[PDB]
Every structure is written in structure tokens, then in C-alpha cells.
Amino acid sequence: EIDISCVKIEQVIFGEVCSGHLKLPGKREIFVAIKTLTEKQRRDFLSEASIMGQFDHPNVIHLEGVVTKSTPVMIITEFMENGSLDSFLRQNDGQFTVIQLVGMLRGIAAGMKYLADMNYVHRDLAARNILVNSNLVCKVSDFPIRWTAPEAIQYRKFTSASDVWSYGIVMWEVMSYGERPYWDMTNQDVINAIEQDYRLPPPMDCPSALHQLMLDCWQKDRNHRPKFGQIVNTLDKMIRNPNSLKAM
């Protein structure tokens, strides 16, 4: 995809994850994220970019390209200054407004909408899998029992409704500034709590309209859960009317 002369490795922050610059002929020099790196492991490394390369959305990490003809093998994705959403929020506990947090969630749900629409089931949707930039824009990456829907744990049923459950856990993660879902419960304690109608309590200062949307995402019956298009509509109706976020 990309000629090695267009790539320039600056710093480090399967293999190693690096920072760098990308200047293609007849294009501006842009700051990028470059991942570097066994026959089976080389097939697994490049397969992520094969799935990723099929997507073109503002809330899905953009693949600038791949370098295969030279050593080492490189995955050149767009740069995300603020890294993973879970750690980013943990470092900024109580720093953003409710509107700013709902904006992040609307971004995640929109990228998830696009993926679902493309017949794709993520199966690993969580805040540690969401990347953030200087614009506070949230993008789905990585192409997890306490994020997995019950039906998917019980009879391995994975759909975009099981991704909606995962999205509900991300919603809770965002509103709690990246804390651990179910805190110090074991993976088995979570499974049994979830099967016996237990649902994560609303985080402190969390609006009623936001907690109810998480509850809909966590409906025992997957067909009763909202679709990603409905989630985006719900969060847009909240940004449009910020009074609906006043009641706790």
C-alpha cells in the first residue's frame, strides 16, 4: 500500500507501537500511528488491517495503509493523541461536562452504527478499544466476559444486539470516568449476577435518561434492546434538549 520513503519513525509510546510522519507523493505530511512486528502471527497481524481497510467512517480508526515489501511490517493508522478512552477518562475524572460525555457516546454509537450496517459484529467493544484525539472524537479500534451479553456467554450468540449490550457497558464506563465494570467481582460472579437480573448501578451525577438507555442496552431479550441507529437518535435528542439530562 505505502512506499517506505513516505514513512518516518519518530518515537515509541505482536510487536511495537510507534509514532511517526507520513508524506505521500502529491499529498501533505500528516502525523500517524505506526505498529511494527512466525508465518501464522504475520497472517494475524496483517488481517487486522484487512478488516480495517474495508471501513471509511469518522468514528472507526482510519487505515492510511500497510508496508509488506520491506522489513519491518508496518500498519499505518491515523494518530490519536489522547490514546485509549478508559485511561484518558481515568486521568480526567470529573473534567468534562455531561454534554461532552454524551458527545463521546454519540461518536462511539455512530461508528458502531456504520460497522453493524456493514454486517460486522465487533465482539470486543469496550472503552480500552475506543481511541481519542485532540478533538475529543471517539473511534472504534481492535478489529471480555464483563462486556459480553448473556446469550453470547451461554450459547455463543453474537450479533449487533450483543454489541449493543457491550455499548451499554461502555456507556457506564464513560459516565464513571473509565472505572472497572463490576469493580472487584470475579468473571463468574458477574455471569451469575447478570443471569439473576443484576445491572450496574448508575454512576454518581449520571442523568436518568442516560441510565435508562444503558438499561435498554442491557435488556435480557436481545430483540428488545435498541438498535445503534435508535441509540444515536436518543443521544442526539439529549444534546438538542440538554434539560433532559438535569434529572438524576
3-class SS letters over the chain: CCCHHHEEEEEECCCCEEEEEECCCCCCCEEEEEEECCHHHHHHHHHHHHHHCCCCCCCECCEEEEECCCCCCEEEEECCCCCEHHHHHHCCCCCCCHHHHHHHHHHHHHHHHHHHHCCCCCCCCCHHHEEECCCCCEEECCCCHHHCCHHHHHHCCCCHHHHHHHHHHHHHHHHCCCCCCCCCCCHHHHHHHHHCCCCCCCCCCCCHHHHHHHHHHCCCCHHHCCCHHHHHHHHHHHHHCHHHHCCC
Whole-angstrom Cα distance, residue 13 to residue 219? 39
14 annotated as ligand-binding: yes
Q: What pairing do the DSSP bridges indicate for beta strands 63-67 and 130-132?
A: unpaired
Q: Which residues lie closer than 8 Å to 111 by C-beta, 6 or more apart?
A: 57, 58, 59, 60, 138, 139, 140
Whole-angstrom Cα distance, residue 200 to residue 185? 12
Closest CA to 133 of 81, 76, 84, 60: 81
Q: Which residues lie closer than 8 Å to 219 by C-beta, 6 or more apart?
A: 225
Residues 105 and 200 in one domain: yes
Residues 38 and 97 in one domain: no
Q: What technique determined this structure?
A: X-ray
Residues 93 and 205 in one domain: yes
Count up the domains in the chain and report the number.
2
Whole-angstrom Cα distance, residue 216 to residue 86? 22
Question: CATH number of the domain that 147 lies in?
Answer: 1.10.510.10
Residues 235 and 147 in one domain: yes
Residues 180 and 67 in one domain: no
Count of CA atoms in the C-beta half-sphere (13 A) of 152 = 21
Residues 71 and 96 in one domain: no
Is the CB of residue 188 less than 8 Å from the CB of residue 146?
A: no
Active site residue 124: yes
By the 10 Å C-beta count (0-12 exposed, 13-18 middle, 19+ buried), 216 is classed as: middle
Domain boundary among 79, 114, 145: 79
Q: Which residues lie closer than 8 Å to 38 by C-beta, 6 or more apart?
A: none
Give residue 136's identity as a one-letter amino acid code.
L
Domain boundary among 79, 102, 129: 79
Whole-angstrom Cα distance, residue 170 to residue 58? 19
Domain boundary among 64, 79, 94: 79
Cα angle vertex 163, ends 160, 168, to 5°? 130
Chain centre to alpha carbon of residue 33: 17
Residues 70 and 99 in one domain: no
Cα angle vertex 140, ends 212, 14, to 5°? 135
Is the CB of residue 170 less than 8 Å from the CB of residue 193?
A: no
35 annotated as ligand-binding: yes
Whole-angstrom Cα distance, residue 173 to residue 103? 14
Whole-angstrom Cα distance, residue 99 to residue 120? 29
Helix pair angle (208-217, 160-175), 10° resolution: 150
Chain centre to alpha carbon of residue 56: 15
Residues 146 and 218 in one domain: yes
60, β-bridge pairs: 140
Closest CA to 35 of 18, 14, 11: 18
Residues 74 and 120 in one domain: no
Closest CA to 135 of 45, 58, 48: 58
Residues 122 and 187 in one domain: yes
Task: At 162, give phi and psi (nearest 5°).
Answer: -80, -25
Q: Which of 124, 142, 216, 236 is catalytic?
A: 124
By the 10 Å C-beta count (0-12 exposed, 13-18 middle, 19+ buried), 29 is classed as: exposed
Residues 230 and 141 in one domain: yes
Task: At 193, give phi and psi (nearest 5°).
Answer: -70, -50
Closest CA to 59 of 96, 99, 103, 114: 114
Resolution of the structure in the document, Å: 2.3
Is the CB of residue 226 less than 8 Å from the CB of residue 199?
A: no
15 annotated as ligand-binding: yes
Task: At 17, give phi and psi (nearest 5°).
Answer: -95, 120
Cis peptide before 25 (omega within 30 of 0): no
**Cα–Cα distances in Å, from 154 out to 157, 172, 242?**
8, 23, 39
Count of CA atoms in the C-beta half-sphere (13 A) of 9 = 14
**Residue 189 belongs to domain spanning:** 80-245
Residues 167 and 219 in one domain: yes
